[PDB]
Design an enzyme around this catalytic site. Structure first.
Site, PDB file in Angstrom:
ATOM      1  N   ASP A 148      54.056  76.496 123.257  1.00  0.00           N
ATOM      2  CA  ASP A 148      53.544  75.136 123.083  1.00  0.00           C
ATOM      3  C   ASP A 148      52.370  74.829 124.013  1.00  0.00           C
ATOM      4  O   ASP A 148      52.186  73.695 124.460  1.00  0.00           O
ATOM      5  CB  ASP A 148      54.668  74.120 123.298  1.00  0.00           C
ATOM      6  CG  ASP A 148      55.952  74.514 122.593  1.00  0.00           C
ATOM      7  OD1 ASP A 148      56.031  74.354 121.357  1.00  0.00           O
ATOM      8  OD2 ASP A 148      56.884  74.983 123.277  1.00  0.00           O
TER       9      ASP A 148
ATOM     10  N   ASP B  55      51.469  71.382 129.978  1.00  0.00           N
ATOM     11  CA  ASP B  55      52.876  71.011 130.058  1.00  0.00           C
ATOM     12  C   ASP B  55      53.706  72.274 130.273  1.00  0.00           C
ATOM     13  O   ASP B  55      54.691  72.521 129.576  1.00  0.00           O
ATOM     14  CB  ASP B  55      53.322  70.261 128.796  1.00  0.00           C
ATOM     15  CG  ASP B  55      54.699  69.634 128.941  1.00  0.00           C
ATOM     16  OD1 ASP B  55      55.265  69.669 130.054  1.00  0.00           O
ATOM     17  OD2 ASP B  55      55.213  69.096 127.936  1.00  0.00           O
TER      18      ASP B  55
ATOM     19  N   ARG C 122      61.257  74.574 129.968  1.00  0.00           N
ATOM     20  CA  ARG C 122      61.618  74.069 128.648  1.00  0.00           C
ATOM     21  C   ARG C 122      60.596  74.481 127.598  1.00  0.00           C
ATOM     22  O   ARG C 122      60.902  74.514 126.404  1.00  0.00           O
ATOM     23  CB  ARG C 122      61.730  72.545 128.675  1.00  0.00           C
ATOM     24  CG  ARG C 122      60.464  71.872 129.143  1.00  0.00           C
ATOM     25  CD  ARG C 122      60.518  70.365 129.051  1.00  0.00           C
ATOM     26  NE  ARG C 122      59.258  69.801 129.524  1.00  0.00           N
ATOM     27  CZ  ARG C 122      58.991  69.541 130.798  1.00  0.00           C
ATOM     28  NH1 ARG C 122      59.895  69.774 131.736  1.00  0.00           N
ATOM     29  NH2 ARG C 122      57.813  69.044 131.139  1.00  0.00           N
ATOM     30  N   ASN C 123      59.384  74.793 128.051  1.00  0.00           N
ATOM     31  CA  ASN C 123      58.317  75.230 127.159  1.00  0.00           C
ATOM     32  C   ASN C 123      57.987  76.705 127.384  1.00  0.00           C
ATOM     33  O   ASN C 123      56.857  77.150 127.176  1.00  0.00           O
ATOM     34  CB  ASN C 123      57.089  74.327 127.316  1.00  0.00           C
ATOM     35  CG  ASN C 123      57.384  72.879 126.938  1.00  0.00           C
ATOM     36  OD1 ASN C 123      58.119  72.616 125.987  1.00  0.00           O
ATOM     37  ND2 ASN C 123      56.822  71.939 127.685  1.00  0.00           N
TER      38      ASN C 123
HETATM   39  C1  LIG Z   1      71.700  78.643 119.329  1.00  0.00           C
HETATM   40  N1  LIG Z   1      70.356  78.367 119.859  1.00  0.00           N
HETATM   41  C2  LIG Z   1      69.866  77.068 119.371  1.00  0.00           C
HETATM   42  C3  LIG Z   1      68.593  76.668 120.125  1.00  0.00           C
HETATM   43  N2  LIG Z   1      67.624  77.745 119.914  1.00  0.00           N
HETATM   44  N3  LIG Z   1      66.230  77.691 119.935  1.00  0.00           N
HETATM   45  C4  LIG Z   1      65.773  78.898 119.684  1.00  0.00           C
HETATM   46  N4  LIG Z   1      64.441  79.333 119.615  1.00  0.00           N
HETATM   47  C5  LIG Z   1      63.321  78.527 119.398  1.00  0.00           C
HETATM   48  C6  LIG Z   1      63.295  77.182 119.661  1.00  0.00           C
HETATM   49  C7  LIG Z   1      62.116  76.436 119.417  1.00  0.00           C
HETATM   50  C8  LIG Z   1      62.083  74.974 119.705  1.00  0.00           C
HETATM   51  C9  LIG Z   1      63.192  74.184 119.402  1.00  0.00           C
HETATM   52  C10 LIG Z   1      63.175  72.828 119.673  1.00  0.00           C
HETATM   53  C11 LIG Z   1      62.062  72.240 120.247  1.00  0.00           C
HETATM   54  C12 LIG Z   1      60.956  73.017 120.558  1.00  0.00           C
HETATM   55  N5  LIG Z   1      59.818  72.447 121.144  1.00  0.00           N
HETATM   56  C13 LIG Z   1      58.973  71.660 120.449  1.00  0.00           C
HETATM   57  O1  LIG Z   1      59.186  71.417 119.275  1.00  0.00           O
HETATM   58  C14 LIG Z   1      57.795  71.095 121.126  1.00  0.00           C
HETATM   59  C15 LIG Z   1      57.479  71.317 122.405  1.00  0.00           C
HETATM   60  C16 LIG Z   1      56.314  70.683 122.867  1.00  0.00           C
HETATM   61  C17 LIG Z   1      55.727  70.728 124.156  1.00  0.00           C
HETATM   62  C18 LIG Z   1      54.584  70.041 124.419  1.00  0.00           C
HETATM   63  C19 LIG Z   1      53.968  69.281 123.431  1.00  0.00           C
HETATM   64  C20 LIG Z   1      54.513  69.217 122.170  1.00  0.00           C
HETATM   65  C21 LIG Z   1      55.690  69.916 121.875  1.00  0.00           C
HETATM   66  S1  LIG Z   1      56.615  70.032 120.383  1.00  0.00           S
HETATM   67  C22 LIG Z   1      60.966  74.377 120.294  1.00  0.00           C
HETATM   68  C23 LIG Z   1      59.737  75.174 120.640  1.00  0.00           C
HETATM   69  C24 LIG Z   1      58.740  75.001 119.489  1.00  0.00           C
HETATM   70  O2  LIG Z   1      57.492  75.609 119.833  1.00  0.00           O
HETATM   71  N6  LIG Z   1      61.049  77.035 118.938  1.00  0.00           N
HETATM   72  N7  LIG Z   1      61.049  78.406 118.667  1.00  0.00           N
HETATM   73  C25 LIG Z   1      62.152  79.144 118.889  1.00  0.00           C
HETATM   74  O3  LIG Z   1      62.147  80.342 118.650  1.00  0.00           O
HETATM   75  C26 LIG Z   1      66.880  79.746 119.503  1.00  0.00           C
HETATM   76  C27 LIG Z   1      67.998  79.017 119.645  1.00  0.00           C
HETATM   77  C28 LIG Z   1      69.432  79.475 119.535  1.00  0.00           C
END
Ligand SMILES: CN1CCn2nc(Nc3cc(-c4cccc(NC(=O)c5cc6ccccc6s5)c4CCO)n[nH]c3=O)cc2C1
Length: 264
Positions: free
Chosen positions: A145, A127, A131-132
């Site tokens: 991810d 994936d 976004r990832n």
């Molecule tokens: C003001 N801003 C707000 C948004 N933001 N996000 C930041 N940094 C990170 C985000 C995530 C994050 C946030 C939401 C969703 C996801 N994504 C997921 O939870 C998933 C993605 C996938 C892809 C494929 C299969 C399963 C999943 S679960 C992530 C990445 C986590 O690894 N992870 N690690 C970070 O450092 C820093 C900021 C500053």
């Protein structure tokens, strides 16, 4: 690497993903981490813990670092390297008018370096997309991810005709036969290069997923973004061969990218 949840301090909500809530916090009062709190029913947990050792062995500067997991409790925690500027897609869209062409290429390079390493370990992302990918405070892009798609319990995501399936990042053999390989990651990487050089546009905009599947099967490919040179577009286009075995490796793509750099 089983982390002691007592060593974790939650600080801020970072948003929501396929496994639910993600939080920013600290590990042992010093290391900035992201913590995925796995929603019950969203993951094949047994299957994930069963294959956790290999993810633990994956280490690279351009890969988001796994700190560890918490499995002696529910919900499960997955703890990861925090990346201040968040995911690449929004970063592109938010800083769209600030990017120089050299920067766009370095981003592609960051990602490609990570994928070469994964390729070398016969490990698939499944994936790959902006976004990832995540971006840190110095503008370094890192792949995130990788491999987690295998553990998702959501028919809308796991099915090729599902609403959440990454159709626009998938080659024909995936959409048709669900044949994942290095070459499917290659195809996705080309679309990612396109996301970068288009500064965060959606692939096949105004096309549905089905229409997109129909058209790439018939040979249609993403147009060259304005900021992409012909040399750069040739690189991303090479990832989109109908036949997977005609697609390059990440080692070759990296050489291509380096050659373009050197010429500039
Ligand atoms: C003001 N801003 C707000 C948004 N933001 N996000 C930041 N940094 C990170 C985000 C995530 C994050 C946030 C939401 C969703 C996801 N994504 C997921 O939870 C998933 C993605 C996938 C892809 C494929 C299969 C399963 C999943 S679960 C992530 C990445 C986590 O690894 N992870 N690690 C970070 O450092 C820093 C900021 C500053």
């Amino acid at each position: 690497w089983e982390i002691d949840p007592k060593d974790l301090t939650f600080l801020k909500e970072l948003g929501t993903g396929q496994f639910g809530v993600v939080k920013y916090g600290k590990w042992r009062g010093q290391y900035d981490v992201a913590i995925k709190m796995i929603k019950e029913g969203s993951m094949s947990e047994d299957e994930f813990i069963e294959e956790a050792k290999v993810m633990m062995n994956l280490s690279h500067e351009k890969l988001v670092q796994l700190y560890g997991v918490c499995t002696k409790q529910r919900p499960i925690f997955i703890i990861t390297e925090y990346m201040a500027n968040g995911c690449l897609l929004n970063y592109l869209r938010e800083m769209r008018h600030r990017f120089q062409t050299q920067q766009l290429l370095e981003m592609c390079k960051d990602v490609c370096e990570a994928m070469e390493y994964l390729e070398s370990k016969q490990f698939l992302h499944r994936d790959l997309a902006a976004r990832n990918c995540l971006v840190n405070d110095q503008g370094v892009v890192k792949v995130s991810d990788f491999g987690l798609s295998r553990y998702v319990l959501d028919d809308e995501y796991t099915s090729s005709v599902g609403s959440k399936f990454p159709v626009r990042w998938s080659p024909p053999e995936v959409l048709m036969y669900s044949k994942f390989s290095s070459k499917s990651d290659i195809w996705a990487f080309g679309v990612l290069m396109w996301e970068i050089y288009s500064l965060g546009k959606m692939p096949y905009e105004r096309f549905t997923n089905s229409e997109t599947a129909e058209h790439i099967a018939q040979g249609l490919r993403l147009y060259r973004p304005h900021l992409a040179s012909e040399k750069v577009y040739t690189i991303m286009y090479s990832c989109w061969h109908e036949k997977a075995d005609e697609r390059p490796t990440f080692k070759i793509l990296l050489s291509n990218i380096l050659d373009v750099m050197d010429e500039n």
